[PDB]
Design a protein around this ligand. Structure first.
Ligand SMILES: [Co+2]
Length: 386
């Protein structure tokens, strides 16, 4: 399908012919330099590779304000999560419109040149309330107030190179690369699966079922960048994904890593995910229960309703030109030796076998056996005493 906004803003491709010139400038002694923070590095990779199309830079206050209150850029284009370059007060004081800033990675690798449009002090309370629902315990709000700089710098970017990664080379396909991969296989219908956790037999079954019902193929698109605090190590997860994809039906699935910095912003994040996956070439997107949700706060109160994400994305589906596929968990039916959607099993006389996240975690820590009906032996081994 077409990128969000119609154009894949692959700035690496756009500025390829001026890389030497931009690199030279970024290394000059007179240019202002900003060392990107971990979250900014994830965000900038997705802006530069077109993952955040139509974005071509960090949001100026005009667009930021519209995103915060109306979930749209100033021109009306759907966009739910503000992507801004947050800096400290002193740095903001040295900036003025038209100032060109060299953005670096690890204070040594030139990533891009930002042409400043504005520098402003956002009202973070409004951002926390409108974008993240206001609970002080929400991961995005804690980040917003404690870690994020208090000043935002809006501006357009010119690309030099994508952030450098030293893990799993070639596994982070860009939107252009994935789109070509799909086209090369004549995959016009692709259902994307978001995850920041390991995958078991049930996930293999639900994604395969989703693909078959939609007459499409499967894109396992796990996040490897910034996920939820306490998640399984990224190396363990990647090994799990590489192994489990081998268990999929002949030529129905493809695996690629997404270097996204999740905000754990529930429904708004689910819409953002749909946009991102559309930019990466997907036609369908699975939306889970409490999709991208932080769970419950200290008082046992859910940050988001379980179906808020599904409902919000469904409401924007026509505008996004993407199809929403509700996450349909499957379970194992021993009396029929088959897998079926938990929904399919009405409150009647039907037995099922399951292993809770709690039981799984505890068995893995004591070397307890895990049944094959729950997960493939090769996958379990990877999670074993990890
Ligand atoms: Co690593």
């Amino acid at each position: 399908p077409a990128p969000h906004g119609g154009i894949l803003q692959d700035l690496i491709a756009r500025d390829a012919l001026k890389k030497n010139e931009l690199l030279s400038e970024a290394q000059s002694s007179d240019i202002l330099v900003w060392n990107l923070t971990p979250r900014q590095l994830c965000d900038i990779e997705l802006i530069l590779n077109g993952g955040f199309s139509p974005l071509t830079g960090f949001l100026n206050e005009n667009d930021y304000s519209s995103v915060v209150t109306d979930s749209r850029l100033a021109d009306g284009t759907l966009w739910t999560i503000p992507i801004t370059l947050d800096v400290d007060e002193a740095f903001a004081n040295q900036i003025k419109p038209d100032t060109r800033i060299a953005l670096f990675q690890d204070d040594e690798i030139p990533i891009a040149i930002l042409t400043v449009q504005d520098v402003y002090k956002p009202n973070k309370t409004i951002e926390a309330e409108k974008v993240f629902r206001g609970d002080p315990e929400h991961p995005a709000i804690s980040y917003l107030f404690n870690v994020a700089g208090d000043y935002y710098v809006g501006g357009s970017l010119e690309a030099i190179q994508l952030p450098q990664h030293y893990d799993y080379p070639g596994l982070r396909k860009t939107p252009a690369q994935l789109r070509l991969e799909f086209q090369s296989r004549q995959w016009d219908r692709v259902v994307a699966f978001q995850t920041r956790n390991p995958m078991h037999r049930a996930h293999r079954e639900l994604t395969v079922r989703a693909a078959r019902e939609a007459n499409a193929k499967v894109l396992i698109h796990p996040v490897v960048g910034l996920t939820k605090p306490g998640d399984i190590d990224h190396h363990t997860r990647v090994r799990v994904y590489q192994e489990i994809i081998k268990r999929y039906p002949n030529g129905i699935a493809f695996l690629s890593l997404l270097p996204l910095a999740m905000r754990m912003s529930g429904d708004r994040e689910a819409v953002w995910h749909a946009i991102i996956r559309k930019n990466y070439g997907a036609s369908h997107f699975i939306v889970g229960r409490d999709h991208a949700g932080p769970g419950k706060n200290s008082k046992g109160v859910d940050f988001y309703g379980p179906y808020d994400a599904q409902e919000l994305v469904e409401s924007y589906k026509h505008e996004l030109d993407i199809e929403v596929v509700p996450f349909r968990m499957v379970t194992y039916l021993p009396d029929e030796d088959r897998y079926a959607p938990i929904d399919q099993i009405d409150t009647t006389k039907t037995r099922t076998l399951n292993i809770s996240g709690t039981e799984l975690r505890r068995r893995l820590r004591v070397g307890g056996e895990i049944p094959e009906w729950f997960s493939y032996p090769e996958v379990v081994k990877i999670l074993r005493e990890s």
